[PDB]
């Protein structure tokens, strides 16, 4: 089989995890999607000349059992850490997602991309510079997206695969 990348989208409720995932997989923006549904999706894509399979988990936070959270975190190879630019709390939560994923995987070297979503909205509480400072501290890429206009979406997910490939080659 062609190579498959297991990607996990994490972040506070309401930040756009579902909207981003459906934009990438189905190329449309969804106004409402039950905030409690946690599904995964497959899409074949070409990234820098490589035909590959993306397997993306759109997380919904708590699980029936905490062992399930641990299971997706060990299985997933890269993590999109999403906040919304209009939700300071979602940005603060990023510290906790960072910590947890590293701690389940028992690794200092986990492919992640920091994503500030809803960039189309006028309302902003999190400035670009503050998110840049965070990403610099983590040594990972940062991208601002709009699930609504699709701006930065393929960049966010393809950048994550690129981080995974850097990780593999060590
Ligand atoms: N304007 C705008 N709204 C968005 C964007 N992403 C998500 N939303 C909306 O924000 C709400 C939460 O999105 P959702 O994908 O359910 O968030 P999730 O809880 O992280 O899965 C929904 O009403 C979406 O339509 C975006 O980039 N721009
Ligand atoms: O029930 C939880 C979510 C689905 N689970 C996994 S491991 C995944 C299901 N699809 C995925 C795509 C990327 C990374 C992980 C997954 C098991 C734990
Ligand atoms: Mg959702």
From Swiss-Prot:
N-acetylthreonine modifications at: 3
Post-translational modification (record): Acetylation at Lys-105 prevents interaction with guanine nucleotide exchange factors (GEFs). Lysine-depalmitoylation by SIRT2 promotes its localization to endomembranes in endocytic pathways.
Name the record gives this protein: GTPase KRas
Effect ascribed to mutating residue 62 to R: In a colorectal cancer sample; somatic mutation; promotes interaction with SHOC2 and PP1C
Effect of residue 59 to I: In NS3; affects activity and impairs responsiveness to GTPase activating proteins; exhibits only minor alterations in its in vitro biochemical behavior compared to wild-type protein
Coiled-coil segments on the chain, per record: none
Binding site for GTP: 11-19, 30-36, 60-61, 117-120
Known glycosylation sites: 36
Family: Belongs to the small GTPase superfamily. Ras family.
Record PTM N6-acetyllysine, positions in chain: 105
